[PDB]
Scaffold this motif. Structure first.
Motif, short mmCIF file in Angstrom:
data_model
loop_
_atom_site.label_atom_id
_atom_site.label_comp_id
_atom_site.label_asym_id
_atom_site.label_seq_id
_atom_site.Cartn_x
_atom_site.Cartn_y
_atom_site.Cartn_z
N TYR B 66 0.82 -1.20 0.00
CA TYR B 66 0.00 0.00 0.00
C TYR B 66 0.86 1.26 0.00
N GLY B 67 1.93 1.26 0.79
CA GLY B 67 2.85 2.38 0.75
C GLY B 67 3.42 2.60 -0.64
N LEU B 68 3.81 1.52 -1.31
CA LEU B 68 4.38 1.65 -2.64
C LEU B 68 3.36 2.21 -3.62
N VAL B 69 2.13 1.70 -3.58
CA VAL B 69 1.13 2.15 -4.54
C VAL B 69 0.78 3.61 -4.31
N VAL B 70 0.65 4.04 -3.05
CA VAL B 70 0.36 5.44 -2.81
C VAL B 70 1.54 6.31 -3.22
N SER B 71 2.77 5.84 -2.97
CA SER B 71 3.94 6.61 -3.34
C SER B 71 4.01 6.82 -4.85
N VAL B 72 3.77 5.76 -5.62
CA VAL B 72 3.79 5.91 -7.07
C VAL B 72 2.61 6.76 -7.54
N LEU B 73 1.45 6.61 -6.91
CA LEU B 73 0.29 7.40 -7.30
C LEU B 73 0.57 8.89 -7.14
N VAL B 74 1.25 9.27 -6.06
CA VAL B 74 1.65 10.67 -5.90
C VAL B 74 2.86 11.03 -6.75
N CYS B 75 3.65 10.04 -7.17
CA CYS B 75 4.88 10.33 -7.90
C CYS B 75 4.58 11.05 -9.21
N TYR B 76 3.55 10.61 -9.94
CA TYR B 76 3.20 11.27 -11.19
C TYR B 76 2.89 12.74 -10.98
N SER B 77 2.30 13.09 -9.84
CA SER B 77 1.92 14.47 -9.54
C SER B 77 2.95 15.06 -8.59
N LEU B 78 3.83 15.90 -9.14
CA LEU B 78 4.85 16.56 -8.33
C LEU B 78 5.20 17.89 -8.98
N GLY B 79 5.78 18.77 -8.17
CA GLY B 79 6.09 20.13 -8.59
C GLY B 79 5.65 21.10 -7.51
N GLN B 80 6.12 22.34 -7.62
CA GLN B 80 5.89 23.35 -6.60
C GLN B 80 4.61 24.15 -6.83
N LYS B 81 3.75 23.74 -7.75
CA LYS B 81 2.52 24.46 -8.04
C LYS B 81 1.28 23.72 -7.53
N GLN B 82 1.45 22.73 -6.66
CA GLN B 82 0.30 22.03 -6.11
C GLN B 82 -0.41 22.89 -5.08
N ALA B 83 -1.74 22.79 -5.06
CA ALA B 83 -2.53 23.61 -4.16
C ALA B 83 -2.32 23.18 -2.71
N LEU B 84 -2.68 24.07 -1.79
CA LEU B 84 -2.57 23.81 -0.36
C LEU B 84 -3.76 23.04 0.19
N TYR B 85 -4.97 23.34 -0.30
CA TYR B 85 -6.10 22.45 -0.03
C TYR B 85 -5.78 21.04 -0.50
N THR B 86 -4.97 20.91 -1.54
CA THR B 86 -4.44 19.64 -2.00
C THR B 86 -2.95 19.51 -1.71
N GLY B 87 -2.47 20.23 -0.70
CA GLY B 87 -1.06 20.23 -0.35
C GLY B 87 -0.79 19.66 1.03
N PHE B 88 -1.86 19.46 1.81
CA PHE B 88 -1.73 18.95 3.16
C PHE B 88 -2.45 17.62 3.37
N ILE B 89 -3.40 17.26 2.50
CA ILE B 89 -4.02 15.94 2.58
C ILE B 89 -2.98 14.84 2.44
N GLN B 90 -1.80 15.16 1.90
CA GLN B 90 -0.78 14.14 1.68
C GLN B 90 -0.37 13.49 2.99
N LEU B 91 -0.15 14.29 4.03
CA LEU B 91 0.27 13.74 5.32
C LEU B 91 -0.81 12.83 5.91
N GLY B 92 -2.04 13.34 6.01
CA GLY B 92 -3.09 12.57 6.64
C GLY B 92 -3.42 11.30 5.89
N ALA B 93 -3.57 11.40 4.57
CA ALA B 93 -3.89 10.22 3.76
C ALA B 93 -2.84 9.14 3.97
N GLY B 94 -1.57 9.50 3.86
CA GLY B 94 -0.52 8.51 4.01
C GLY B 94 -0.47 7.91 5.40
#
Lengths: 200, 159, 51, 346, 157, 344, 159, 159, 160, 159
Positions: B66-94
């Protein structure tokens, strides 16, 4: 020493108090105030921290309960394998907590809504983050206690019914109490959901 | 900065993926360190357990992905232009999914280590042990719903 | 309106919980390292009417 | 507690007169002492028949103390009347003159001044702001100190009362005299200076004054300095009072050999008792203020209970609130007797 | 709004409610687990007296109700977007604090006392007349906190 | 504590309880009443937890040694299995439990000075749990006191070895007994301290109660044995009698000072507990009954590591009761029946 | 508003009353846990002193109610707006009662259980057990009186 | 307000008074916990000696009010308009006296709990026992003396 | 400097480069101790299984090189004024690989130490026990590969 | 001053070398302290292995050499004119060598004692004991290679 962990815990707390008190002595008792940062926080803080716990606590508590119950069941299984048909109903209690714990995440996500940096501190969204965070706390704690209590009750039943297994009905009324906690924790959160708004 | 363009959203995605991947690893490792040694202490003198009751190993290894699949799922989406409403769910979801896996693996490992000795003393009991194991695994599986919800919230919308 | 921006960096909303994660990791490390091995299970004395 | 040697003055009689009054001043309430003395009177009246029937093991011993209970209770009523407190309530109509301007705003801190004093004083008029509490508490601690020194000085009276009866005035008197001076020249001086407040006032006639209670370190650190304007010849006799206590130590520590014979081991046995008595002086000196503390605590607890019961009963409701007040008093009497007297006095 | 009515006033009340539920149910769980321990100890040997000695265990949900009544007294008491007398939220927190630990104390005490008492009750029934006293007596200790919660809450509300 | 005590050890208690449930209860002693001939005892011992190994190899004539060794073989197996599966702290606790037996075993080692008994015979005469694999101590001269140094440097019992060169060494017949008693006292005190500092509070009490009962019982029995032969010094008695009774450490000193039946009677009356004298024809039977009733308190606590200790003691005393019934049947003594422990 | 009465000035008033109650409840629970177990221990054997040995339990509940009564008395003496100094003193007073209550709760149980042990067979301890209890509870009101004294002082000097 | 009489100086009186009360309360409670259990043995052993045994606990009681007296004494020296110098000196005095009393309670209880045993066999042994014990509350008295000096300096010197 | 290219961006590189190596080193040392203790325990008493059981040491070396295979890889991907986003990715990758190597190190030593005795008693069980050894290797490779994917993302996506 | 060459950039190197050497030093100290008892046991058993058991201490010396070389190199890499990035790299390189060195020290002490204690029995062991010795010593090699690579590669390009 008596214990390194408690020693360090005692040593750490003093310095923050000293810093705060001297900061007050320099005329900053309210200058560095918790309410200032609270105003300086974000509703995404509360939303994203109060959602993971909501389900994490429930799942951890259920895992603890089933941890207890399986190790209890094995003991009675050796002497009497037919303990299983009687006792499987008990474990259902430890499982059912997790679904009620996790369902709240869906209503939260329904309340979730992309909110811009404008109006980003008002009750339009800050209130909702607060409320869902509180509800997640309550449900998670309730499911932890439910799981641990049902696990210990199942262990008691396991050790008991090994001899005179016909006593299951005489004790299941007690496990009813442990089951009540899930409903108690769910109802209050659902009631909250009937009063809070969604993110804006 | 504002939700429109922060400088730390990809940082938060990366650390959340790290959290999830490390969580699942140790969740597996605990159950392994229990059940593998517990069985090896038994099958040595109980050779009738070579492969007939090694299910807990696989049951624990299931959670390692599960860690691997979530890591790869987020891997495609990266960069410094991600929103903050969508910039903090990363911690909680993981972290939710990771700790769910920790607890599920803990519960799985205890009963897996119990079952080998239960069967060695009485090889008619694991019929219930595997049932309890599958009951326990869904506990960790639960968090994947919010995992995918927040993954869709983040990867699909970054701003 | 924010706290002291000198003693605390501008990103003081973000460098907080990192230590909490490490605390959780270390407390889990202690408990995982607490387990035993049962050396005697596979190496022990014997006698004709003994294990 | 113990016994003593032959032909020595036993202290049986002093207890009977002494102990009951110090117990009495612990609470000093007319109602409390009244009820307990009524119980003791019933006990001593019914013992004509009850002396033979058995009671609870401790209840029997309780029955065995009617004289003691009555003796403490009489002093309890005496001191309570001395303090005008029926559950910390005043009934005094002995008004002697205090500045009470007829025009007061509801809330204005209307003060007063000594425009006339009841010779006993301590009347209802002292029921006002916390200034009353401060005055009363300071007065009571002064009284406790005074009574304590009086009692100690009296106790020292009998020390030689037996040696004269034994003609043992060979080495003991040389011990009685030094300790006598050591205790007196200090504590009696303290007491006379304390009553010096009643001797002279520095504001009725404009003069510098010391603190309400502290005039102490001037003797010890500073040699022969008053620095507080208490009395002129103090500047000269302060050094004397300080100094005649020094030679007491060398005088006391070596007296055995003179009465030849000499051992060398019991020879030094004096010093332990010398220092023991020295520390006893100060320890017992400070001891007596507990009486003050307990009296104050009893007064406060009685007052708070009285408030939170009676004033609540003062609420206006006569239709069914009569039942409310009935239940209120039913509870209050039981509390204010049992849980407010039994453990306290015991 | 006014500094006396900031943008986080409901925070206090809802934190207090959350504390109330979590602590009340914690106490309930601990107490019922402790009672179940004694029930298990007494079951096998004499599996008949358990029915007539259910006095401790029935106290499981009593503290839960203690907490739930206080919670529902102010559950959803604030609008989804509203600022109110901040002192009102302060006292909402204060009463939750007052009520969230007497319940734990009572639950622990009753659970352990009753567990031991019932475990030893096997031999004689004479302690029956006395056992219930301490249990109800801790229940009234919890009642202290629960009632003072309402007393404070209605005040200044 | 409580649940916190159960973080990874949720199965050891379960298996211990499963083993304990195999103990013979009162409804099993109903057959002990019907047990009046060796055939009946064999038939019963082909139907119980001790079933079909006390008779599969043994003949109809049930001899004490064979029956007890067969019964205790499986107990050794189970104890060794538990110790192997026990945690490190529990492993050390089991090691101390076995240290009593192997203090007795090293006492047998040293005692041999007139027969030079074989090591195999000695380990046959004591619990094999009190024997690791060998002990190269008999190589040195086996005098009354000439191996205490060798055993101390060989066995790990330096703490449990109270100095036997101080007062236990007098080249006397008392040696082969006073060394045993002194080492037993030392081990009892060491185990008492261990259970005081480890073995958490429920398990603590479950230890100290039975440990004190056993220590006081040993005190009384060795005092009787001394009074049943040449007497000893009161200081020697204290060296023999466990100085700390662990239930009452004051009356043991009274017994030590007492050198007459009346003195020990007085020292026993003030104990406010069981009275061994004046009411016991076979004091050992009453002591065993009371000890098992007391260790039943260990099972009265569901959360304590004392379960294994109480279980082993109960099983050993039950085997003792079975042997006692067998022998009283051999002597045709139906009165010595009912001496079996009736708590479980 | 008033500089000397900030927003949290009433916060201190509100919070300085929910503290002593909790401490008293915990102390009473600890005392009764220490006592009742031993009470039923000495009741199962010799079912004679049961009613006799209930003295310390009620006596400990008496202390327990101290915090409740003090808190309810002080709360009425508060209001929506009160001095920051008034809050200071309310907070300072809302603790001492409970602290002394725990001080009692410890010794009362620790001595009462031993007294019960001694009295289970020595009935002469009727004068004994309460002898230490009375001395224990006298301190149970030391902080109680100062709490109300400081409450009265808080009724004045408000801003 | 100003550095001489600011808003925080009253906090010293609000709290500084509640220090000695608690330290002495805890010291007395610990002294009781130690010594009182002692009677539970000798009473059953020899109920004869019941009076001489109680002295140490009552000495602890004597110490127990050393803090209450100073607390009530300074209770008037405080106020919303006092000086922080007065707060400093009051706090120092209260801490000194209370902790000294706590130390005295430590020493007296930890010796009395064994003197109870010592005097059991020797009813007249208490002669030296009292000699040793008196020192503890004498030390408490030195602990409380300087509080009076500082408060006298705290009732006339301001700003 | 700027938001996407601060002067302190390569601080993350300097951290991540040194991170994984020590995680792997300590996990390895743990495994080596845990296994070698039992191996040398059995060597003297059983001089027939002493050297036919030394696959765990090789697997420990593999997990030791796990960190190295990425250390210099990310070192040479770092600059004095890198993008802070690259630092974001690389620190996570390095710590993740380090922790995966740690988990492998914990598992391998215990499993090998158990299996060595399981075989010394019953050599029939040797292949059967050593088969399970590879589970820890797979677990270590899991984090390894995911973190390498994130490293490739960092080295491919540059906001400098 | 400028982050391109601040006075506190070399502060990094002021401590990196110390840490690199200290870690190896403590690891070696612990390893030698542990193995001393085992070598003493084997030698007193038979004084024919003493000269044949000296490898672990010399290996500890080489472990310390690993930190010594990096410390000496960075001694000349320090300077007041050095970038903050050049500061970061200093610790980034100096930490790993020392940490791997202490890990190797621990492992070698463990295994070397466990082997030497058994050396006297079967000399067949000695042909295999060097195996894990080298397999662990290569840990310091892995650490040192990367440490010095970073040192040389990033000490330049100060900017």
């Amino acid at each position: 020493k008596f214990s390194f962990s408690h020693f360090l815990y005692y040593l750490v707390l003093i310095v923050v108090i000293v810093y705060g008190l001297y900061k007050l002595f320099t005329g900053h008792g309210s200058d560095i105030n918790f309410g200032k940062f609270l105003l300086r926080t974000s509703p995404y803080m509360w939303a994203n921290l109060g959602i993971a716990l909501c389900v994490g606590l429930s799942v951890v508590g259920a895992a603890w309960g089933i941890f207890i119950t399986g190790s209890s069941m094995i003991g009675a299984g050796v002497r009497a394998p037919r303990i299983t048909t009687k006792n499987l109903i008990s474990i259902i209690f430890c499982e059912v907590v997790a679904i009620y714990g996790l369902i709240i995440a869906i209503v939260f996500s329904s309340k979730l809504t992309v909110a811009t940096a404008e109006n980003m501190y008002s009750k339009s969204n800050l209130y909702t983050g607060y409320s869902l965070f509180w509800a997640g706390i309550t449900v998670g704690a309730s499911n932890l206690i439910c799981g641990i209590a049902v696990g210990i009750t199942g262990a008691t039943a396991a050790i008991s019914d090994a001899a005179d297994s016909a006593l299951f009905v005489k004790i299941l009324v007690i496990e009813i109490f442990g089951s009540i906690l899930g409903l108690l924790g769910l109802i209050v959160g659902l009631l909250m959901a009937g009063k809070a708004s969604e993110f804006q | 900065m504002t939700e429109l363009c922060p400088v730390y959203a990809p940082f938060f995605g990366a650390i959340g993926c790290a959290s999830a991947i490390i969580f699942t690893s140790l969740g597996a490792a605990y159950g392994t360190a229990k059940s593998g040694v517990g069985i090896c202490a038994t099958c040595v003198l109980r050779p009738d357990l070579l492969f007939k009751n090694i299910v807990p190993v696989i049951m624990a290894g299931i959670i390692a992905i599960y860690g691997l699949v979530v890591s790869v799922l987020v891997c495609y989406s990266l960069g410094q232009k991600q929103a903050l409403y969508t910039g903090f769910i990363q911690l909680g979801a993981g972290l939710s999914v990771g700790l769910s896996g920790l607890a599920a693996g803990f519960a799985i490992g205890i009963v897996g280590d119990a079952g080998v000795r239960g069967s060695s003393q009485q090889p008619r009991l694991f019929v219930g042990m595997i049932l309890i194991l599958i009951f326990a695994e869904v506990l960790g599986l639960y968090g994947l719903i919010v995992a995918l919800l927040l993954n869709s919230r983040a990867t699909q919308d970054v701003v | 309106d924010i706290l002291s921006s000198i003693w605390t960096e501008g990103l003081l909303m973000c460098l907080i919980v990192s230590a909490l994660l490490l605390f959780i990791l270390i407390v889990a490390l202690s408990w995982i390292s607490n387990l035993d091995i049962t050396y005697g299970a596979l190496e022990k004395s014997t006698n004709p009417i003994k294990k | 507690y113990g016994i003593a040697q032959y032909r020595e003055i036993n202290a049986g009689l002093p207890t009977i007169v002494t102990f009951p009054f110090m117990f009495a001043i612990m609470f000093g309430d007319m109602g409390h002492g009244f009820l307990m003395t009524l119980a003791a009177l019933s006990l001593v009246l019914n013992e004509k028949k009850i002396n033979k029937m058995k009671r609870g093991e401790i209840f029997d011993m309780a029955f065995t103390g009617r004289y003691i209970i009555l003796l403490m209770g009489v002093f309890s009523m005496y001191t309570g009347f001395l303090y005008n407190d029926i559950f910390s309530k005043t009934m005094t109509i002995f008004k002697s003159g205090w500045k009470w301007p007829d025009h007061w705003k509801k809330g204005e801190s209307i003060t007063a001044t000594s425009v006339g004093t009841y010779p006993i004083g301590l009347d209802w008029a002292w029921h006002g702001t916390e200034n009353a509490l401060l005055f009363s508490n300071s007065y009571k601690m002064k009284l406790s100190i005074l009574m304590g020194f009086i009692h100690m000085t009296y106790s020292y009276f009998f020390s030689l009362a037996n040696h004269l009866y034994f003609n043992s005035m060979i080495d003991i008197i040389g011990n009685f005299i030094p300790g006598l001076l050591f205790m007196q020249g200090i504590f009696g001086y303290l007491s006379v200076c304390i009553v010096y407040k009643w001797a002279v006032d520095w504001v009725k006639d404009g003069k510098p004054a010391p603190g309400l209670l502290n005039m102490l370190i001037n003797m010890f650190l500073s040699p022969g300095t008053i620095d507080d304007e208490l009395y002129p010849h103090q500047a000269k006799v302060q050094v004397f009072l300080l100094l005649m206590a020094l030679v007491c130590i060398p005088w006391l520590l070596l007296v055995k050999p003179l009465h030849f014979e000499d051992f060398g081991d019991i020879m030094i046995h004096q010093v332990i008792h010398t220092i023991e008595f020295c520390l006893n002086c100060v320890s017992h000196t400070a001891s007596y203020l507990r009486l003050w503390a307990l009296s104050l605590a009893h007064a406060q607890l009685s007052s708070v209970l009285w408030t939170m019961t009676i004033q609540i009963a003062f609420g206006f409701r006569g239709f069914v609130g009569v039942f409310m007040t009935v239940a209120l008093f039913a509870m209050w009497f039981a509390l204010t007797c049992a849980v407010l007297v039994l453990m306290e006095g015991t | 709004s006014n500094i006396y009515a900031p943008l986080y006033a409901p925070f206090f009340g809802f934190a207090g409610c959350a504390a109330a539920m979590v602590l009340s149910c914690l106490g309930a769980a601990i107490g019922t687990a402790k009672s179940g321990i004694g029930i298990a100890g007494i079951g096998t040997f004499k599996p008949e007296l358990i029915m007539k000695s259910l006095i401790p265990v029935v106290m499981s949900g009593i503290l839960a109700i203690y907490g739930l009544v206080v919670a529902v007294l102010i559950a959803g008491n604030l609008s989804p977007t509203e600022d109110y007398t901040l002192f009102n939220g302060f006292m909402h927190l204060s009463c939750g604090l007052c009520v969230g630990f007497a319940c734990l104390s009572s639950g622990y005490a009753i659970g352990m006392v009753g567990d031991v008492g019932v475990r030893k009750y096997m031999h004689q029934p004479r302690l029956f007349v006395g056992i219930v006293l301490i249990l109800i007596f801790s229940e009234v200790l919890g009642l202290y906190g629960m009632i003072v919660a309402l007393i404070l809450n209605t005040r200044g509300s | 504590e409580g649940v916190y005590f159960n973080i990874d050890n949720g199965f050891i208690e379960g298996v211990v309880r499963g083993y304990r449930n195999g103990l013979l209860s009162n409804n099993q002693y109903i057959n002990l009443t019907q047990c009046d001939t060796l055939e009946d005892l064999k038939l019963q011992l082909s139907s119980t937890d001790y079933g079909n190994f006390l008779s599969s190899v043994s003949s109809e004539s049930l001899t004490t040694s064979l029956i007890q060794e067969y019964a205790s073989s499986k107990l050794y197996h189970e104890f060794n299995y538990i110790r192997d599966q026990s945690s490190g702290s529990t492993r050390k606790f089991m090691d101390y439990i076995t240290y009593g037996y192997m203090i007795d075993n090293v006492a047998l080692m040293i005692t041999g000075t007139i027969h030079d008994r074989d090591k195999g015979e000695i380990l046959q005469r004591c619990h094999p749990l009190g024997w690791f694999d060998t002990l190269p101590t008999l190589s040195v001269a086996t005098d009354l006191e000439s191996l205490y140094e060798t055993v101390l440097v060989d066995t790990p019992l330096a703490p449990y070895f109270k100095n036997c060169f101080d007062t236990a060494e007098e080249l006397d017949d008392m040696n082969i007994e006073i060394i045993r008693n002194k080492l037993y006292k030392a081990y009892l005190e060491d185990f008492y301290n261990f259970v005081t500092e480890e073995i958490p509070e429920p398990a603590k009490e479950c230890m100290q109660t039975l440990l004190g009962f056993e220590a006081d019982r040993r005190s009384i029995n060795i005092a009787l044995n001394s009074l049943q032969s040449s007497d000893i010094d009161p200081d020697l008695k204290s060296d023999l009698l466990p100085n700390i009774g662990k239930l009452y450490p004051l009356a043991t000193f009274h017994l030590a000072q007492a050198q007459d039946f009346e003195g020990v009677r007085a020292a026993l009356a003030n104990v406010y507990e069981y009275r061994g004298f004046l009411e016991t024809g076979n004091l050992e039977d009453h002591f065993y009954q009371l000890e098992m009733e007391l260790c039943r308190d260990a099972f009265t606590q569901q959360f304590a590591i004392s379960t294994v200790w109480a279980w082993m003691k109960s099983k050993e005393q039950e085997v003792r009761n079975i042997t006692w019934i067998a022998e009283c049947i051999a002597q045709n003594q139906r009165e010595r029946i009912n001496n079996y422990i009736s708590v479980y």
